[PDB]
């Protein structure tokens, strides 16, 4: 029980770190998708 508590503490910490990293790459992917869709709409309305 002592070593299991230690292993689950360290696994929660590693999972929280990877949640933080994946949230950062989710946000930059979100911004890239918004900018891509925006450039497509603006390019369409300008080439019209």
């Amino acid at each position: 029980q002592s070593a299991r508590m230690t292993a689950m503490d360290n696994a929660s910490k590693n999972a929280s770190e990877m949640i933080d990293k994946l949230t950062l790459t989710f946000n930059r992917t979100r911004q890239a998708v918004i900018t891509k869709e925006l450039i497509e709409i603006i390019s369409g309305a300008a080439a019209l």
Binding site: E40, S43, G44, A47, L48
Partner: protein, 503 residues
């Protein structure tokens, strides 16, 4: 010399005639706004005075956008543009077989001119619901995985979708190299005339492709149609329609034909270049609207013909690459939506070890068991259901969720059939050896046999069956169904070979 003399001086008519022309405005980047052609018809082959064709699209009241078939240095502002008088057309014959033909009709391989007879319009209308009949013939590829999970029908279209560098062109060339044994045989229904339209590739890949087909003796089904990278964007645009028109010639004569559209996304990007240079509004990912209509024409030019219309079939298989496996991109969603059969390669199984790298459950053939032989249907349906069970139980029991005897049975049979479906490059096998080896894999006799030893089992088993069991394989492939005496005989031979394998 003298024959060359007389063919030069008799062949050209020099029959001058009054003809519609028009001068040229902006010759931008392969596009030419031509002022004057007030009787040109839409999408027509027209001819620039330096000897080079162009195709008239985008008829506007100002001017006509003719997009050139080739180089742009050879065109100035102010030169004539003569109407040829007809829609752009492809010269098709059966003497076009085994010869690399540049996208219009122009055989650029150094083996003389093409002996064509039947000119054909390239933008033709596909057949309707009455001239078509359903898939009946089993289009075999020689790949165990394709012919046992996603079989093709003579009468059908089926994608080869993946990411870059996965084995898609190699699957297409396995499909080509299988059909030699049906060409040199007896039945006309088995024989193959295929058209490999290489869109937007490099010339040395097409050259080494022709090397592999000539060394494998493929050049009587095959018609290689190369619109490479240095070719203009309308040659890359128009090349798979040319291969479709040649396939339609063979189909409407009544010969079972196919077309492999290698790198069909290059047609999509060449047509994107054409639309953005002809100033059409861009849609999504800067591809215009009618890219789906483009590929939809191109891919619905193929299904089995009626028994009163010759009986010839067409098998369209286009090869398409995604980027980072993104199936949700514009061209993969369009080309999945038009086709029905589709073979999915994910690539992590290519680096993990199965070849050809069909990563699988995404891949589906809607015609299913109708496009198999009777033996492969009798054997390989429980294999597909077992692989589905295996995939889902391994997916939740990645860590050892619950292991009874049933779960280790599922993982055992799943891993063993996974190593059954491995197959080397450029080695297609016939249907009867596939029925024999999937019989040795699914119907017991391999479930507890050390999964690293499956490949040597494959090699020694094929050596055994090709050694003293050729007439029995003849019975299997000619009788259709695997008969009950042949069933118990395959049981006895796989048991004897299990002894000789643990010998």
């Amino acid at each position: 010399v003298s024959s060359i003399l007389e063919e030069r001086i008799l062949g050209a008519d020099t029959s001058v005639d009054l003809e519609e022309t028009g001068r040229v405005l902006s010759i931008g980047d392969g596009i030419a706004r031509v002022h004057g052609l007030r009787n040109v018809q839409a999408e027509e082959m027209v001819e620039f005075s330096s000897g080079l064709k162009g195709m008239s699209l985008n008829l506007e009241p100002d001017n006509v956008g003719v997009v050139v078939f080739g180089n742009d240095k050879l065109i100035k502002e102010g030169d004539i543009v003569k109407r040829t008088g007809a829609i752009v057309d492809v010269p098709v014959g059966e003497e076009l077989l085994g010869r690399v033909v540049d996208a219009l009709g122009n055989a650029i391989d150094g083996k003389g001119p093409i002996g064509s007879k039947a000119r054909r319009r390239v933008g033709l209308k596909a057949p309707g619901i009455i001239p078509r009949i359903s898939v009946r013939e089993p289009m075999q590829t020689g790949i165990k995985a394709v012919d046992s999970l996603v079989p093709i029908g003579r009468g059908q279209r089926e994608l080869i979708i993946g990411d870059r560098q996965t084995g898609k062109t190699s699957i297409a060339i396995d499909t080509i190299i299988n059909q030699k044994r049906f060409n040199d045989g007896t039945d006309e229904k088995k024989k193959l005339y295929c058209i490999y339209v290489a869109i937007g590739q490099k010339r040395s890949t097409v050259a080494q492709l022709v090397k592999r087909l000539t060394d494998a003796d493929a050049m009587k089904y095959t018609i290689v149609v190369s619109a490479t990278a240095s070719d203009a964007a309308p040659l890359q645009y128009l090349a798979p329609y040319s291969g479709c028109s040649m396939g339609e010639y063979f189909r409407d004569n009544g010969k079972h034909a196919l077309i492999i559209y290698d790198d069909l996304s290059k047609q999509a990007v060449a047509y994107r270049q054409m639309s953005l240079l002809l100033r059409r509004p861009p849609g999504r990912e800067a591809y215009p609207g009618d890219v789906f209509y483009l590929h939809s024409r191109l891919l619905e030019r193929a299904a089995k013909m009626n028994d009163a219309f010759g009986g010839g079939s067409l098998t369209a298989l286009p090869v398409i690459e995604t980027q980072a496996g993104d199936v949700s991109a514009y061209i993969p969603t369009n080309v999945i939506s038009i086709t029905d059969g589709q073979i999915f390669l994910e690539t992590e199984l290519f680096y993990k070890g199965i070849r050809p790298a069909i990563n699988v459950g995404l891949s589906v053939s809607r015609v299913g068991s109708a496009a198999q032989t009777r033996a492969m249907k009798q054997v390989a349906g429980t294999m597909k259901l077992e692989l589905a069970q295996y995939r889902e139980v391994a997916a939740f029991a990645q860590f050892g969720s619950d292991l009874d005897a049933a779960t280790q049975q599922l993982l055992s049979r799943g891993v063993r059939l996974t190593e059954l479906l491995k197959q080397g490059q450029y080695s297609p096998m016939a249907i009867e050896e596939q029925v024999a080896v999937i019989y040795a894999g699914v119907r017991g006799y391999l479930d507890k046999l050390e999964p690293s030893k499956i490949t040597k089992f494959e090699n020694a088993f094929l050596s055994h069956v090709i050694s003293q069991h050729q007439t029995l394989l003849g019975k299997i492939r000619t009788d259709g169904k695997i008969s009950e005496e042949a069933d118990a005989k395959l049981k006895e031979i796989v048991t004897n070979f299990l002894a000789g394998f643990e010998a």
